[PDB]
Amino acid sequence: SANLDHTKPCWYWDKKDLAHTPSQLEGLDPATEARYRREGARFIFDVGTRLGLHYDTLATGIIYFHRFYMFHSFKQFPRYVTGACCLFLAGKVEETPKKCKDIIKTARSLLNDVQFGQFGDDPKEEVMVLERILLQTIKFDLQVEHPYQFLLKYAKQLKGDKNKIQKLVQMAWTFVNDSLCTTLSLQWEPEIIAVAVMYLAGRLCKFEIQEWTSKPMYRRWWEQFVQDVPVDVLEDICHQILDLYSQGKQQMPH
């Protein structure tokens, strides 16, 4: 959904297209969709963290969840059951598997009765059934890359005060986690999110990253890592992350 049909294993949409998700087409308010996405993401993060899963596994589950709701509505598919299913699938793909049973017990421990009521009378079965729909929906395209690897690789190429750079990376890593609550992973490649979270940390701390480039350059510092990315794109990404800290966002893109 969002735009055409044929931009599905091109897994990227303009923010504009995000006004046309299945849920919005069915009448759901943009702010409510945004909240359901943040709630589902944080649920996958919390469940996965309780199960001790590696951060790349939590991120893969969240990317599957965001892609799922480009083709189906929150009206039909309760968000926490999708979250559980996406984490279950991601643990298999990333070779850190967990029993469905254990994901369910963990969900029960973190959700109140009304939230856990989404799982119905047979929670394990609801998740196992949904996995088939999930796999078809994400076109069995299971391998995903996240911004964290690129944040580390690019920061390693910065030459300057080790303590300012360390701080930049710690702040930027928090911003990558935060970005997983938004639809940013459906808008830009993970290399561009990594440069944007470094750009955001630099702006917040008044750090001149341009001064840490290993050789002097005419063009914008990030042009050594990604090609033809205008500053306006980095600023858009920044604003969408900072929205999470300004109240509780609920700005579902358009």
Question: Domains in the chain and their CATH numbers?
Answer: 1-143 (1.10.472.10), 144-254 (1.10.472.10)
Neighbours of 206 (CB within 10 A): 6
Q: Are 73 and 56 in contact (CB under 8 A)?
A: no
Task: Compute the CA torsion angle 128, 58, 78, 181 (nearest 10 deg).
Answer: -160
* Inter-CA distances, 150 with 65, 160, 198, 233, Å: 22, 19, 10, 17
- Would you say how long the chain is, in residues? 254
Neighbours of 254 (CB within 10 A): 12
* Inter-CA distances, 236 with 2, 103, 180, 249, Å: 19, 35, 15, 14
**Radius of gyration over every alpha carbon of the chain, rounded to an integer in angstroms:** 19
Q: In sequence order, which residues have a C-beta less than 8 Å from that of residue 5 and are 6 or more positions away?
A: none
Q: Are 177 and 241 in contact (CB under 8 A)?
A: no
Q: In sequence order, which residues have a C-beta less than 8 Å from that of residue 170 and are 6 or more positions away?
A: none
Q: In sequence order, which residues have a C-beta less than 8 Å from that of residue 210 and are 6 or more positions away?
A: 217, 220, 221
What is d(CA 101, CA 128) in angstroms, rounded to the nearest whole number?
10
What is d(CA 64, CA 82) in angstroms, rounded to the nearest whole number?
9
Ranges assigned E (strand) in 57-162: none
* Inter-CA distances, 88 with 65, 129, 152, Å: 11, 12, 27
Classify 188 in phi/psi space as left (phi over 0), alpha (psi -120 to 50) or beta. Answer: beta
Residue 203, amino acid: R
What is d(CA 13, CA 36) in angstroms, rounded to the nearest whole number?
19
Tokens read off for 98: 């967990």
- Give buried/exposed letters for 98-115 (b at 16+ CB in 10 A, else e): bebeebbebbeeebeeeb
Angle between helices 123-137 and 100-110 (to 10 degrees): 110
Q: Are 72 and 137 in contact (CB under 8 A)?
A: yes
Reference 30, options 249, 187, 252; nearest CA is 252
* Inter-CA distances, 200 with 15, 170, 172, 183, Å: 19, 12, 7, 17
The experimental technique behind this entry is X-ray
Burial of residue 16 (CB within 10 Å: 0-12, 13-18, 19+) is exposed
What is d(CA 91, CA 191) in angstroms, rounded to the nearest whole number?
23
What is d(CA 22, CA 29) in angstroms, rounded to the nearest whole number?
11
> What is the experimental resolution, given in Å to one decimal place?
1.5
Each as own residue / partner, the long-range contacts of residues 54-57 (CB below 8 Å, 24 or more positions apart, any chain) are: 54/94, 54/96, 55/148, 55/177, 56/94, 56/146, 56/148, 57/87, 57/90, 57/91, 57/94, 57/96
